[PDB]
Design an enzyme around this catalytic site. Structure first.
Site, PDB file in Angstrom:
ATOM      1  N   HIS A   1       0.843  -1.188   0.000  1.00  0.00           N
ATOM      2  CA  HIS A   1       0.000   0.000   0.000  1.00  0.00           C
ATOM      3  C   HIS A   1       0.882   1.242   0.000  1.00  0.00           C
ATOM      4  O   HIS A   1       1.754   1.367   0.867  1.00  0.00           O
ATOM      5  CB  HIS A   1      -0.924  -0.004   1.208  1.00  0.00           C
ATOM      6  CG  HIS A   1      -2.082   0.933   1.083  1.00  0.00           C
ATOM      7  ND1 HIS A   1      -2.266   2.007   1.928  1.00  0.00           N
ATOM      8  CD2 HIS A   1      -3.118   0.959   0.212  1.00  0.00           C
ATOM      9  CE1 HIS A   1      -3.364   2.654   1.582  1.00  0.00           C
ATOM     10  NE2 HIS A   1      -3.901   2.039   0.544  1.00  0.00           N
TER      11      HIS A   1
ATOM     12  N   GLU B   1       2.030  11.114  -3.504  1.00  0.00           N
ATOM     13  CA  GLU B   1       2.803  10.840  -2.298  1.00  0.00           C
ATOM     14  C   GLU B   1       3.872  11.898  -2.059  1.00  0.00           C
ATOM     15  O   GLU B   1       4.126  12.281  -0.908  1.00  0.00           O
ATOM     16  CB  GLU B   1       3.432   9.452  -2.391  1.00  0.00           C
ATOM     17  CG  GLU B   1       2.446   8.298  -2.258  1.00  0.00           C
ATOM     18  CD  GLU B   1       1.386   8.535  -1.200  1.00  0.00           C
ATOM     19  OE1 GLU B   1       1.746   8.917  -0.066  1.00  0.00           O
ATOM     20  OE2 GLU B   1       0.191   8.334  -1.499  1.00  0.00           O
TER      21      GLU B   1
ATOM     22  N   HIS C   1     -16.052   1.922   7.231  1.00  0.00           N
ATOM     23  CA  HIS C   1     -15.877   3.087   8.091  1.00  0.00           C
ATOM     24  C   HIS C   1     -16.886   3.104   9.231  1.00  0.00           C
ATOM     25  O   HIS C   1     -16.544   3.466  10.362  1.00  0.00           O
ATOM     26  CB  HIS C   1     -15.978   4.364   7.262  1.00  0.00           C
ATOM     27  CG  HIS C   1     -14.855   4.540   6.290  1.00  0.00           C
ATOM     28  ND1 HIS C   1     -14.807   3.880   5.083  1.00  0.00           N
ATOM     29  CD2 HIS C   1     -13.741   5.304   6.346  1.00  0.00           C
ATOM     30  CE1 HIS C   1     -13.710   4.229   4.437  1.00  0.00           C
ATOM     31  NE2 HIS C   1     -13.045   5.093   5.182  1.00  0.00           N
TER      32      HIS C   1
END
Ligand SMILES: *[C@@H]1O[C@H](CO)[C@@H](O[C@@H]2O[C@H](CO)[C@@H](O)[C@H](O)[C@H]2NC(C)=O)[C@H](O)[C@H]1NC(C)=O
Ligand SMILES: *[C@@H]1O[C@H](CO)[C@@H](O)[C@H](O)[C@H]1NC(C)=O
Ligand SMILES: *[C@@H]1O[C@H](CO)[C@@H](O)[C@H](O)[C@H]1NC(C)=O
Ligand SMILES: *[C@@H]1O[C@H](CO)[C@@H](O)[C@H](O)[C@H]1NC(C)=O
Ligand SMILES: *[C@@H]1O[C@H](CO)[C@@H](O)[C@H](O)[C@H]1NC(C)=O
Ligand SMILES: *[C@@H]1O[C@H](CO)[C@@H](O)[C@H](O)[C@H]1NC(C)=O
EC number: 3.4.17.23
Lengths: 596, 193
Positions: free
Chosen positions: A327, A357, A487
Site C-alpha cells: 500500500h 505521495e 468506516h
C-alpha cells in the site's frame, strides 16, 4: 510564579521526550512494514505500548494547569490538545465492554463469508470474490444474490451489538461536556478565541446543507444521463421515471460510479489518453519516475529531497523471500527523516501516485519547525487535498508533451476532453450525495431524533430523496445495512471526503489565477510559476498553529468553503449534458419500486 | 617543533558541552597543512582576524576549548547569539578575537539504536557570563521554592542528546573547537611558519 510560566517548562519537557519515543515507535513500525517476521511484530507491540502509556501518564499530569489563566494561544492550543480526557472517564467495566464490542465488530466484518446453496464448499469472502462480481458481472440475478447475501449474513449479527455501541459512546461524550458523539466528531472544525475567525460546532451542518443546495442541478442531469444508458444494458428492469436500483451501481455500496464508465462512454471510437507504452519503450524505471516528480516540484520553488529519502526509501518490490505490504504510504518518522513506501511498476497510474505521495511529503516537510503537537494539517481535509491537486496538474496533455512522453503531432479534439471530464465526474460528483446522506443519518441517530424502531425505515427514505437510489428487496427492522461498510463498523468519521473535495478545487483555481492561465480550468498546469509556489508555501508552513479559516484565506482570499469552483471546472460537461437531455425527463419520483 | 594538532583534533573521546575542557598551548609553529589530507571542516569562521593572515601573526597566549553539539545549534557559537547553548552552557563575549572550527562526526558518534552519552543543561536561574562553567546538580524549582524530590515541577537540569545514524542533517553530531588567542605586551608563544 505565574501559571503561564510554569506550563511553558512542562511543554518543553513534553516535546523533548515525545520526539524520542515517537521516533523509536516509528522505526519499529517501519521495520515491520518492510520485513514481516514474528519478532518484528513483538517489537512493534512493545514500542506502541510504551508510547501509549507515556501519553496517558503525561495527560494525567497536564490537568493541573487551568485553561482560563493562559493568554498565549499557542500554549492553550497545546494544552487543550493534551488535556482531552479520552475514554478513561468511563468506569473500568464499561470501558472493557466497549473495547470488546469494537474488537468483535472489527473481526466479524473482516472474516465474514457467504456461499450459494448446493455448494457448501466454495464460499467467497468480500475480498477478492464479492468485489470482482460486483465490479465486473453483467447479470441481474448474480448481482442481486451477492448484494442480499452479504447484507443478510453479516448485517444481522451487527444490529444488536451496534445498538449497545451507540449508548456507550453517548455516555462518554456526555462526560466530556458534549451534547452527543456527533458533537464530539464535529468539534474538530471548531475554532474559538480569535476575533473575526470564529466557527461554531453547530454551524458546519448549516454550511454543508447550503453547499449541497447548489450541487443538486448538475448532479440531477448526470443522474438522468446514466439512467438512459442503463436502460439499454438492462432493457426491462429500469423505469424511465423512477430511481436507480442499488445493485447496479458499480461497487457494492454505490460509493463510486467508476466501473460504469465502460457502459456510458460518449464516443467509444476515440481511445483514452494512455502513455504506458511510451514509458516501456524508452526504458523507464522507478527511479526515473521519482526524479521526474522531484523536478516538477522544484520548478515551482519548493525544495528538493534530502539524501535520506534516496538512501532509505523502498521504491521497488523486494521480491524473493522477503514479504512487505504494497500500500503506497508516506512516512514522517520525525527528527528529519522522511520516506516513501510503494511497490512501483511502470504504468501511468504509478506515475500519478508518485506525485500524490511526494506532495504529501512536501507538506510534511514544510512545517517541521513547529512544536510537536502542531505538526499536522489545519483540519482533516487539507492533507489529502494538497496531495490531489498535484496529480490533477500532472495529467494534462501539455505537461505530458513537455517531458517528452507524447508526440508533438498529437492534437486534442473536444470529444477527448468530454470523455475525460465524464470519467472524472463519475468519480468526483457521484460520491458527494452518498457521503452527505450517510453523515446526516449518523448525526441524527446519535442525536436521538430517529428512534430505534424506525432506523431502517429512515435509511431507505433518505436514499430515495437525496441520492435517488431504491432497494431491490424490502428490508425489515432486523437488518443493519449501514453497518456493512468499513468506516461505519470500524469507528471512522466520514465528513472528511466532502470538505476534501471542495477544498481541492478551491485551491486549484486560486493557484491557476496567479499563473496567468487563459482558457478552461481543466487544462491548467502550474509548472514554471514561482508565484503559485509561494502562495501555496504560505499556507503549508503554518501547520496547526493558526485557525483553518486564516489558512484558507491565505490562499483563496475567502474565510469559508465555497462550491462555485467545482461548477466552473465542470461547466463544459454541464452544457453538453443539458443539450443531450432534451428528450429525457430530469428528476425522480420516490413512489416507484422494482418489486411494486 | 610541530603543533599538537594531532593530539587535540585526533582525540579518542570529546567531553560534553556543559563540562567543556580548555587546554593551553605552549611554544609552537602553527603548521595546519598536516591536517588537510585527512579531514575537511564543514564550518570554519574567524572573528577579529582573517583566516589567511595566520601565517604572519604571533599570539601572546592561546587556548583551545573542545565540545560536541547538535548540527542546528552550531550557529549559536558566535558573539551576539541567543539560545539554549549560548545562555546556559557556553557563552562567548562580544569583543572576541579567535576562530571556530566545526566538523561532522556522524560515523563514530552515532548508532543504530541511539547514543545517549552527551548531556546539556536546559534550565537555569540566570544567564551565564562569558567563559564560565557550571557543574551543579540541583533540582530547579521554577519559582524559587524548596523541594527534595523529583516529581511535579521539580526537574533535574541535565538532559541527554539523541543521536541516531539515520537522522537528518540537522540532528547529526558535530564536533566543535574554539581557538582563542590574546595579544598583550608579553613574549610571543605560537608563531606562523
Ligand atoms: C518550464 O521551463 C523550462 C525552462 O524554460 C522548460 O524547459 C525547456 O523546455 C523546452 C520545451 O518546452 C525545451 O526545448 C528546452 O530544452 C527546455 N530547457 C530549457 C533550458 O529551455 C520546461 O519545459 C517548462 N515546463 C513546461 C511544463 O513547459
Ligand atoms: C528481515 O528479517 C530477518 C529476520 O531476522 C533478517 O534476518 C533479515 O536480515 C531482514 N532483512 C533485511 C533486509 O534486513
Ligand atoms: C507566546 O509565546 C511565544 C513563545 O516564543 C512568543 O513568541 C509569542 O510572542 C507569545 N505570544 C504573544 C501574543 O506575545
Ligand atoms: C476530565 O477533564 C477535566 C478537566 O480537564 C478534569 O477536571 C477531570 O478530572 C477529568 N476527568 C478525569 C479523567 O478524572
Ligand atoms: C535541487 O537538486 C538539484 C540537483 O542536485 C540542484 O541542482 C538544485 O540546486 C537543488 N535545489 C533546488 C531546491 O532547486
Ligand atoms: C466539437 O466541435 C465541433 C466543431 O469544431 C462541433 O461540431 C462538435 O459538436 C463538438 N463536439 C461536441 C461534443 O459538442
Amino acid at each position: 510564579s505565574t501559571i503561564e510560566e510554569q506550563a511553558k517548562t512542562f511543554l518543553d519537557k513534553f516535546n523533548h521526550e515525545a520526539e524520542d519515543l515517537f521516533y523509536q515507535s516509528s522505526l519499529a513500525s517501519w521495520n515491520y512494514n518492510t520485513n514481516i517476521t514474528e519478532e518484528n511484530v513483538q517489537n512493534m507491540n512493545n514500542a506502541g505500548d510504551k508510547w501509549s502509556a507515556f501519553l496517558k501518564e503525561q495527560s494525567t499530569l497536564a490537568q493541573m494547569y487551568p485553561l482560563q489563566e493562559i493568554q498565549n494561544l499557542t500554549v492553550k492550543l497545546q494544552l487543550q490538545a493534551l488535556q482531552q480526557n479520552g475514554s478513561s472517564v468511563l468506569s473500568e467495566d464499561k470501558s472493557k465492554r466497549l473495547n470488546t464490542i469494537l474488537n468483535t465488530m472489527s473481526t466479524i466484518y473482516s472474516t465474514g463469508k457467504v456461499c450459494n446453496p448446493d455448494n457448501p464448499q466454495e464460499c467467497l469472502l468480500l475480498e477478492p470474490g464479492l468485489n470482482e462480481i460486483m465490479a465486473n458481472s453483467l447479470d441481474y440475478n448474480e448481482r442481486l444474490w451477492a448484494w442480499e447475501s452479504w447484507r443478510s449474513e453479516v448485517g444481522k449479527q451487527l444490529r444488536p451489538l451496534y445498538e449497545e455501541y451507540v449508548v456507550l459512546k453517548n455516555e462518554m461524550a456526555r462526560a466530556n461536556h458534549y451534547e452527543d458523539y456527533g458533537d464530539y466528531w464535529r468539534g474538530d472544525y471548531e475554532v474559538n478565541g480569535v476575533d473575526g475567525y470564529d466557527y461554531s460546532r453547530g454551524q458546519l451542518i448549516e454550511d454543508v446543507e447550503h453547499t449541497f443546495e447548489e450541487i443538486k442541478p448538475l448532479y440531477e442531469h448526470l443522474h438522468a444521463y446514466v439512467r438512459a444508458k442503463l436502460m439499454n444494458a438492462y432493457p426491462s428492469y429500469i423505469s424511465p421515471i423512477g430511481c436507480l436500483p442499488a445493485h447496479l451501481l458499480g461497487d457494492m455500496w454505490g460509493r463510486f460510479w467508476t466501473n460504469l464508465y465502460s457502459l456510458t462512454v460518449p464516443f467509444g471510437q476515440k481511445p483514452n489518453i494512455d502513455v504506458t507504452d511510451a514509458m516501456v519503450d524508452q526504458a523507464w524505471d522507478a527511479q526515473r519516475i521519482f526524479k521526474e516528480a522531484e523536478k516538477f516540484f522544484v520548478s515551482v520553488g519548493l525544495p528538493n529531497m534530502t539524501q535520506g529519502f534516496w538512501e532509505n526509501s523502498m521504491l521497488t518490490d523486494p521480491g524473493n523471500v522477503q514479504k512487505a505490504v504494497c500500500h503506497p504510504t508516506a512516512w514522517d518518522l520525525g527528527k528529519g527523516d522522511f520516506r516513501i513506501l510503494m511497490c512501483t511498476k511502470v504504468t501511468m497510474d504509478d506515475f500519478l501516485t508518485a506525485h500524490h505521495e511526494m506532495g504529501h511529503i512536501q507538506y510534511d516537510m514544510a512545517y517541521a519547525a513547529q512544536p510537536f503537537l502542531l505538526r499536522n494539517g489545519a483540519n482533516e481535509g487539507f492533507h489529502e487535498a494538497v496531495g490531489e491537486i498535484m496529480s490533477l496538474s500532472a495529467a494534462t496533455p501539455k505537461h505530458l508533451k513537455s517531458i517528452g512522453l507524447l508526440s508533438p503531432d498529437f492534437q486534442e479534439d473536444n470529444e477527448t476532453e468530454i470523455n475525460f471530464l465524464l470519467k472524472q465526474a463519475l468519480t468526483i460528483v457521484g460520491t458527494l450525495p452518498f457521503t452527505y446522506m450517510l453523515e446526516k443519518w449518523r448525526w441524527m441517530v446519535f442525536k436521538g431524533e430517529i428512534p430505534k424502531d424506525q432506523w431502517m425505515k429512515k435509511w431507505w427514505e433518505m436514499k430515495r430523496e437525496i441520492v435517488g437510489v431504491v432497494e431491490p428487496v424490502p428490508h425489515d427492522e432486523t437488518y443493519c445495512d449501514p453497518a456493512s461498510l468499513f468506516h461505519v463498523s470500524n469507528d471512522y468519521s466520514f465528513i472528511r471526503y466532502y470538505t476534501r473535495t471542495l477544498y481541492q478545487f478551491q485551491f486549484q483555481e486560486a493557484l491557476c489565477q496567479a499563473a496567468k492561465h487563459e482558457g478552461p480550468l481543466h487544462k491548467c498546469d502550474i509548472s514554471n510559476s514561482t508565484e503559485a509556489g509561494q502562495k501555496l508555501f504560505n499556507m503549508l508552513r503554518l501547520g496547526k498553529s493558526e485557525p483553518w479559516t486564516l489558512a484558507l484565506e491565505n490562499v483563496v482570499g475567502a474565510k469559508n468553503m465555497n462550491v462555485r469552483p467545482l461548477l466552473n471546472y465542470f461547466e463544459p460537461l454541464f452544457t453538453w449534458l443539458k443539450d443531450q437531455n432534451k428528450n429525457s425527463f430530469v428528476g425522480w419520483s420516490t413512489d416507484w419500486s422494482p418489486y411494486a | 617543533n610541530l603543533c599538537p594538532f594531532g593530539e587535540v583534533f585526533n582525540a579518542t573521546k570529546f567531553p560534553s558541552v556543559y563540562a567543556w575542557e580548555r587546554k593551553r598551548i605552549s611554544n609552537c609553529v602553527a603548521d595546519y597543512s598536516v591536517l588537510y589530507n585527512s579531514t575537511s571542516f564543514s564550518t570554519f569562521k574567524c572573528y577579529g582576524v582573517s583566516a589567511t593572515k595566520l601565517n604572519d601573526l604571533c599570539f601572546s597566549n592561546v587556548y583551545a576549548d573542545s565540545f560536541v553539539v547538535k548540527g542546528d545549534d552550531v550557529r549559536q557559537i558566535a558573539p551576539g547569539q541567543t539560545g539554549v547553548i549560548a545562555d546556559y552552557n557556553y557563552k562567548l563575549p562580544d569583543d572576541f578575537l579567535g576562530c571556530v572550527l566545526a566538523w561532522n562526526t556522524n560515523s563514530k558518534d552515532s548508532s543504530i539504536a541511539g547514543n545517549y552519552n552527551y548531556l546539556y543543561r536546559w534550565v537555569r536561574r540566570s544567564k551565564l557570563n562569558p567563559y564560565e562553567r557550571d557543574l551543579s546538580n540541583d533540582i530547579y524549582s521554577p519559582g524559587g521554592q524548596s523541594c527534595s524530590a523529583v516529581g511535579p515541577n521539580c526537574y533535574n537540569p541535565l538532559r541527554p542528546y539523541g543521536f541516531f545514524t539515520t537522522a537528518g542533517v540537522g540532528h547529526q553530531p558535530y564536533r566543535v573547537v574554539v581557538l582563542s588567542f590574546e595579544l598583550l605586551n608579553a613574549p610571543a608563544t605560537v608563531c606562523g611558519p
